[PDB]
């Protein structure tokens, strides 16, 4: 019974991990950045170089 429970838990853990990874990818899908800061907007911030 303990072996069966351990194997079943391994499969449940694997499935939950795959589901969490799918949810994380779905999270990544949305555009992570929409705005920036003001001191990083009107002070030239960078050169192409």
Residues that bind other proteins (CB under 8 A): 31, 33-38, 41-42
Q: Which is nearer to other proteins, 6 or 33 (CB)?
A: 33
Residue at token pair 């009107």: 42
Q: How far is the CB of 42 from other proteins (least distance, A)?
A: 8
Q: Which tokens in the block code for residue 47?
A: 């050169």
Q: How far is the CB of 36 from other proteins (least distance, A)?
A: 5
DSSP, res 42: S
Q: How far is the CB of 22 from other proteins (least distance, A)?
A: 22
Distance (Å, rounded) from C-alpha 49 to C-alpha 22? 38
């Amino acid at each position: 019974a303990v072996m069966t429970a351990v194997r079943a838990w391994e499969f449940w853990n694997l499935k939950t991990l795959q589901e969490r990874e799918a949810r994380l990818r779905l999270e990544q899908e949305e555009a992570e950045l929409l705005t920036y800061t003001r001191e990083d907007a009107y002070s030239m911030e960078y050169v192409y170089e």
